[PDB]
Amino acid sequence: SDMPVAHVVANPQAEGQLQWLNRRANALLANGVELRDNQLVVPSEGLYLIYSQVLFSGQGCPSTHVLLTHTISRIAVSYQTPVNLLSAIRSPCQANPWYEPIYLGGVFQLEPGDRLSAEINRPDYLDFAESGQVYFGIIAL
């Protein structure tokens, strides 16, 4: 179709950080949607479905209370600062392995030039072992 669509995945080699890639099998960047500075750029006005998942993991639980946070934020032309659209928090700890999925998803009205970021607080806990564990995407409805 000709609907602005995006399903970028995390770079499996860029460990310690979360870099979105589009040039992969089963990934999408099309019909006007751009990936600049690791954010997604909206081509046209409309109602967009916006979703994202991250996956954290660890070998054990550090001396502290570990708090994982995943947040899709929006900078609107009509309001230029990241504003939280979708946000969640998870806590694996309170030497066995632990895994922590977080999924964000919702429908939003976006204007042309709006940029969408999908950030996390602890890039050092991401898990890129397999494909489809970490992703960020939008589609114009």
Partner: protein, 162 residues
């Protein structure tokens, strides 16, 4: 119906060439031109004769206590296996995702069945007449030394005495 190494493109309405492992489809066929294929780039691959738009991402580096038994190439993904003395806790589509230590069969129990492949060791209590004074992941319930004259009897933790 098409030849091998070819597929029927719904759009072009004809048999077009498939790309080889190590390359992806850069441009799809038309009534005029055949498939334009292209090499997979950094840390990216395709193991089958395909016609995908881009290549599959190679997995990340193998984790701690793991060995890389197969390098990410253009024609195959990276495979990670456990070092000897360990087993696979969580399998991956191919290889192993999480490694764990083989259980230890303490004094009183013996190694029923091993499996440094993809299954932990199986511990079992020693049946009367056997024992194990060893916390090992290998040793098993060895039969008691039945003496000519029994001094100290036999338990599943220590051998009889003469």
């Amino acid at each position: 119906t098409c030849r091998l190494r070819e597929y029927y493109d719904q759009t072009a309405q004809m048999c077009c060439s498939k790309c080889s492992p190590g390359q992806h489809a850069k441009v799809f066929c038309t009534k005029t031109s055949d498939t334009v294929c292209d090499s997979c780039e950094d840390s990216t691959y395709t193991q089958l004769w395909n016609w995908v738009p881009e290549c599959l991402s190679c997995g990340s580096r193998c984790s701690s206590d793991q060995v890389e038994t197969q390098a990410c190439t253009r024609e195959q993904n990276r495979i990670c296996t456990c070092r000897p003395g360990w087993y696979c806790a969580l399998s991956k589509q191919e290889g192993c995702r999480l490694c764990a230590p083989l259980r230890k069969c303490r004094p009183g129990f013996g190694v029923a069945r091993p499996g440094t492949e993809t299954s932990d060791v199986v511990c079992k209590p020693c049946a009367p007449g056997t024992f194990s004074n060893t916390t090992s992941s290998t040793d098993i319930c060895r039969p008691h030394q039945i003496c000519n004259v029994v001094a100290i009897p036999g338990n599943a933790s220590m051998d009889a005495v003469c």
